[PDB]
Design a protein around this ligand. Structure first.
Ligand SMILES: [Cl-]
Ligand SMILES: [Cl-]
Ligand SMILES: [Cl-]
Ligand SMILES: [Mg+2]
Ligand SMILES: [Mg+2]
Ligand SMILES: [Mg+2]
Ligand SMILES: [Zn+2]
Ligand SMILES: [Zn+2]
Ligand SMILES: [Zn+2]
Lengths: 593, 595, 597
């Protein structure tokens, strides 16, 4: 009955198709992924952290001469290029290889961001299962998550007790390193997160989001001091590591050189540089960050690098190879693993965007890498593919309207929601702000304009604000108003609704995502452990004659073969015919055509 | 009658498809025509073309050296689409933007817009005259240097030509409007660059002599391509009369740290200006280009955003944007760079049939060392031999083959030789040991035998003896310059040959075409006779004809309005009759059903 | 502009298909066109037409009576295709063979080639004038009598019309070329045949008054329709001035033994000549025909081999062959019979769309007594009501409904009313006893209300009381002659009505048609003004248009032949139109027509 349930799934998609793939491109009918051949595992940063704790560990990073490398392929990489649809099956399977083959990596960015949501909602899989599997794959590396400040893994500031609860459960789950950020770089709103992370005695890497151009004397709102002061404020707030999160890939090489020197003088803490390659030059910036003494940098495996993802890992490493700051990673292993992600990635054809290459346009719009495609789909969905260059100009007009602000998740979305509206409804900034021009705003903008996502430097422009709220705005810390959830009473409602006790981890998924979690749960009792199925089967079922292998339980392997399918019955139901370890089964499924 | 022939072309393609596109992905049905950007209407500021004409090539190179700003060459019109779209970019889309470049980006050093693969491909695959194309660009952009890539002794072909043919082609290129010749030999052999270099100088044109980059100067485990190899070559080329020295990093192998040392040293070994061409296969080429800038390089190449990245050049707009404000800021408006790229973006979508399946950067390049312009091509050649699932084995074998030949410079045409070696090794499951095994018969490819014979020139330590002895099957090799053994072409006799096959006089340009590509050219002229001046058609029409009911506007000399009204069934004669309206007048055009 | 009209039609049909044809089967692609037999081609031997013109009808009938050989009427031009091909046979195929009949079978009594369903169906589904058709047959066979079927007061229609309309119609048919009117009444009520009969006599044409056969005179358990019933009507009709008496066995019910008896008796009962028409649904009607001959009948009907058998007439060639060398040998060249039949076979293959699925003979016909011309139609009607699989129930119900109506003569239009009643009966699952039930309300068909009111006349003993009460749901019935009650149409005015609707003058013939079939005629007229003289197109082209690249020769007038090629057909444009590209005598012509999809 574990088996009957996956069989009902891999009859249903075999007949009906996967909704997320029904009418998107198919993969070339022609090369499955092969996990490379590999001993035991060299201790790494995971063991060091256990030995030193987070304060001392960060000091260790500061003192290391080699630049330390975070691999983002398992989170930002596919979040940026494949709409975050990368599956546990493909991620888990390669963890051992990282463990054995690249044991000096600082960390693996493998959680948080859009994965929590999407894993359940679009991929029928538990994110906590994914984390665990990776923990068991790679017990010698730091597992890194991206944590949105007040916003946890969701889109709006939550109650403090919910933020506390999630962070605590994240660490039990296997997270060692929390890169945490606030979408308007408001430190007050980070303090809850930062203290929570420290309580679990894990690494709090407090991020400063980069926007503007520090070397442009005509945009002095986002000058060097603005970054060096924020660094100092975060140190005082109890940070083990400082990150520069260049979410849009705006930091240029000359700027890196200046910024990173200044930062390392402002604070004694180690610094971690994260960026995207939408410009086509982010690697120059990264290398410059390295020349300037930066302690750690993020990159993505070659196969999932470039464009709106992070810059290419292997070439970065190659560029350092032999130099004082050489990071000591085997280029032949980087490739071996890259060839794997390339084979993995071909399975997700259905999710490729039509992005052809670098775009300096990014310096105009400041759209984050991990939004670009997502927003091009909302505009194609709003019937605007043709006017897309206007959408980008709207984003930057829209951005200026708000007083010029940090655009990262979820503020990025708010500005996304505004630009789209403006193009559709043919509105200028000066119409938008006008008093005798009637326009209904996207709930998202009312939300942010009242103060639900925080407060930028000089606050919000008074006039835009009055016309959106039609409702007195507030300027305090959002969760300093928000009543504490009743964790015992918000539990009953999901245990009476799934008629089951749930895990402390399941409860956390609910806090963050009541309905997504709920719908996920109902599915798992129906279809079972679909995560254990290879990615072409999950997405397209089993072709006539085909023979599949899957492990339900460790060391228990099921041989499933689609032998036949029927025509649709007068009931409406179709019958698939299998052979489960030489034992015939008939699985009847409905026809949703 | 020019109208009759274009109609015949449209009917043919409308019914039978274009052979190069019938069976490939089509562009999106919606598809905005590329729109030439409207210009604010200011006149054309004298730029590098005027200076060259004033000072001649030497003083111009001096002027390059002394310019503080870095000078950009834009490669979109040539290396850009050679690397990303199999060189299929048409004149129609190329010439329409020339004037925009001219008005908007007047400080550019040059447009790389000619030579390379364009000469061949334009005739053989697009049915258009590359001399026409250059003429149209010349006339669009009279203030900018026009730049070609010339393969030293290999002309715009694949094989060493007689000297007097090389001389004649270079003479016609100058005449056609090339100002700046980047000239390279595939084994970096100066002895085999002298005829070309001398010919360019004799035309009072810019001779930019290239040194191809390979290996890694900063890796002491690979000393053959060390720093002193490049600086000695720079000096040898100065003595041979170069006005400019290029570093042609055809595979995008040069790393940033290596650029600091390389450009600093080059500019101390010679007073001539330096010009750096690279490729972004690694994903870090913009880093190398900036390092080269920080180190005083005089000029760098880039491609417009929309045709940059990966196997093409690194992104022009983003490189400019990174220099904005610096001492060596190149002085180019980014807004106009974005506007031109927007056009190239719309142009590029029309070429969906020729997009490769390459998803992004690859550090594997530091292993294989495939030039950017070959990669995709080789990868198709492999596919076509049923080796798609073994691409990485082909890359590995390409590296091994490289070492087996003694570690050579791989660029057109040496790179093809190595690619043929690798395909064979994989199809036939041979290791290098097998390849040179005394007990194993191997039918080496002809390009490899020809290489080892001497026909492409001498690499600096000669060819490895045992492989050579085995590949030549008894034939004696030579170490002289291949053109020293070629019979001088009988120009007058040859011109008469082609004038008789075509029953008419041909032009001096057409003759250089014939001398470089006899079959291809002859085929191109015979097509032109049948189909008229197809280059004037917009690109969708050139590849897909006209849809039922479609209205098309074309410029014969007069703008033709052409409607497709109906297409008959295939007749008893195997003919299909297309029923056009030509400016309200009815025209029935019969073509054959080639299914 | 006649040409443009035709090109529009051909464009229309080529792109959109013909509604009568688009869904049913197609003929063979290879399809040998029908070839008109070569003629040695001296003149035409004077035949029965000349005789009638010389003698007048009284004396011509007396000549028939005295004639030793049996005389033959070929029914292939009317009853043959009406019975087998839903009356869809076209003027083109019919006129083209007239001349061959004329040269090769000049001893034929007549050609049945008009009346019946042809008048309606011609205009309604074939877009052609039935008078044009009659005129063309006239032109080609001036030596043979042309014979129509007329339905008494029903005219060529389904109901009793006013007298003046019946008179006016008879006048035109005679003028148009009808020499011999076989006229019948569907309840064999002679009173209702008098107005028809007198009109025909006024025109000095032949009035072949029909007696319709039903039941079995040799079955004594069925006395109503006995030997004397028929001999009495023969006499009653002689006194009403018939020139000839027909026995019209519409359902092919007469058996050989009954013929031996019947035609002996008829000949003694009246001095008029006797003419026998039957159908071969039973698979034995030839035997009945030959028995009728043997017993002294003067004329019999047969259909050409290639349109004989089953629901049509029995086989002419084979009958003539049985009589060959006999005392009453009919003197018809069989070889020519065959040649003409071969032409009709080739003609018939063009009409594959309208083949029914009847396989062979059925004795079931003795049970249901469905006219041979109705059998298939009712079968289609029943499919249309989703009753294919119960067809035998419908056949029994027709037999049950017959007995309920008081056991009647079923022939057009009475046959049509019994049909409707049977179809209702089976759909709605009623016994006879339900239709005749007080406490079961039943919504009868419009045609049955009409018949029981008395709009088709009266049967020998009237209509059964209670069917009439329950059915008329309050209306008083009459037992008089419908025509005696119908306001006599106003002709001068009605002419104006139709002439106003067409913005043009009409002809007397056209006018007769409008009096018969107002809407159908009005529709056919408007179609002619759009599409031109489509009757002149050969049949494939009429039904299917022109294949891509196909060339067509079409005779617009006798003189002028248009060469038409279909060269191309465009995709559908944004206005929903399609342009067809024709060559007309070497000249290019765009005709636009709508995409009716
Ligand atoms: Cl939710
Ligand atoms: Cl050639
Ligand atoms: Cl009517
Ligand atoms: Mg450090
Ligand atoms: Mg300079
Ligand atoms: Mg007689
Ligand atoms: Zn990111
Ligand atoms: Zn290149
Ligand atoms: Zn009949």
């Amino acid at each position: 009955d574990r088996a009957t349930k996956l069989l009902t799934y891999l009859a249903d998609v075999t007949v009906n198709g996967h909704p997320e793939a029904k009418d998107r491109p198919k993969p070339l009918e022609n090369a499955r992924p092969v996990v490379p051949y590999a001993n035991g595992v060299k201790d790494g940063t995971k063991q060091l952290l256990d030995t030193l704790g987070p304060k001392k560990f960060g000091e260790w990073m500061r003192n290391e001469k080699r630049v330390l490398l975070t691999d983002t392929t398992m989170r930002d990489g596919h979040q940026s290029l494949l709409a975050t649809r990368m599956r546990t099956y493909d991620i888990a399977r390669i963890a051992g290889t990282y463990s054995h083959a690249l044991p000096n990596l600082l960390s693996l960015e493998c959680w948080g961001g859009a994965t929590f949501d999407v894993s359940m909602r679009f991929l029928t899989e538990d994110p906590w299962e994914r984390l665990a599997l990776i923990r068991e794959g790679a017990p010698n590396l730091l597992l890194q998550m991206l944590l949105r400040g007040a916003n946890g893994v969701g889109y709006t500031n939550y109650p403090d007790n919910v933020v506390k609860y999630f962070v605590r459960q994240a660490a039990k789950g296997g997270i060692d390193l929390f890169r945490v950020f606030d979408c308007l770089n408001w430190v007050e709103n980070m303090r809850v997160s930062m203290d929570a992370i420290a309580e679990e005695n894990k690494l709090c890497e407090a991020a400063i989001c980069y926007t503007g151009d520090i070397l442009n004397s005509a945009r002095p709102k986002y000058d060097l001091k603005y970054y060096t002061n924020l660094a100092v404020e975060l140190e005082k707030a109890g940070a083990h590591i400082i990150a520069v999160k260049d979410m849009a890939g705006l930091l240029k090489p000359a700027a890196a050189k200046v910024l990173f020197k200044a930062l390392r003088e402002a604070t004694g803490l180690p610094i971690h540089f994260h960026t995207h390659d939408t410009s086509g030059i982010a690697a120059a910036t990264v290398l410059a960050a390295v020349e300037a003494g930066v302690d750690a940098v993020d990159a993505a495996m070659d196969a999932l690098s470039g464009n709106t993802s992070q810059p290419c890992l292997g070439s970065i490493v190659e560029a350092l190879s032999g130099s004082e700051r050489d990071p000591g990673l085997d280029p032949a292993w980087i490739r071996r693993i890259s060839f794997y992600w390339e084979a993995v990635r071909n399975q997700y054809a259905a999710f490729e965007s039509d992005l052809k290459g670098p775009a300096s346009e990014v310096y105009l719009h400041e759209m984050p890498g991990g939004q670009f495609t997502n927003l091009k789909e909302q505009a194609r969905s709003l019937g605007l593919e043709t006017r897309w260059h206007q959408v980008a100009q709207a984003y930057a007009d829209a951005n200026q309207m708000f007083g010029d602000i940090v655009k990262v998740t979820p503020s990025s979305k708010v500005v996304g929601d505004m630009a789209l509206m403006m193009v559709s409804q043919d509105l200028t900034v000066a119409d938008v702000v006008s008093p005798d021009r009637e326009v209904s705003f996207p709930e998202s903008v009312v939300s942010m304009l009242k103060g639900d996502l925080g407060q930028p430097p000089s606050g919000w422009p008074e006039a835009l604000q009055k016309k959106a709220l039609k409702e007195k705005p507030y300027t305090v810390r959002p969760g300093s108003l928000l009543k504490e959830a009743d964790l015992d009473a918000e539990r009953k409602v999901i245990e009476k609704k799934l008629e089951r006790e749930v895990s402390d981890f399941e409860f956390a998924s609910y806090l963050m995502y009541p309905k997504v979690f709920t719908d996920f749960a109902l599915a798992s009792d129906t279809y079972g452990p679909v995560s254990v199925l290879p990615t072409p089967a999950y997405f397209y079922g089993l072709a006539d004659g085909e023979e599949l292998f899957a492990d339900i339980e460790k060391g228990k392997t099921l041989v499933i073969v689609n032998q036949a399918v029927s025509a649709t019955d007068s009931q409406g139901m179709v019958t698939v015919f299998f052979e489960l370890n030489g034992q015939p089964r008939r699985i009847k499924v409905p026809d949703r055509a």
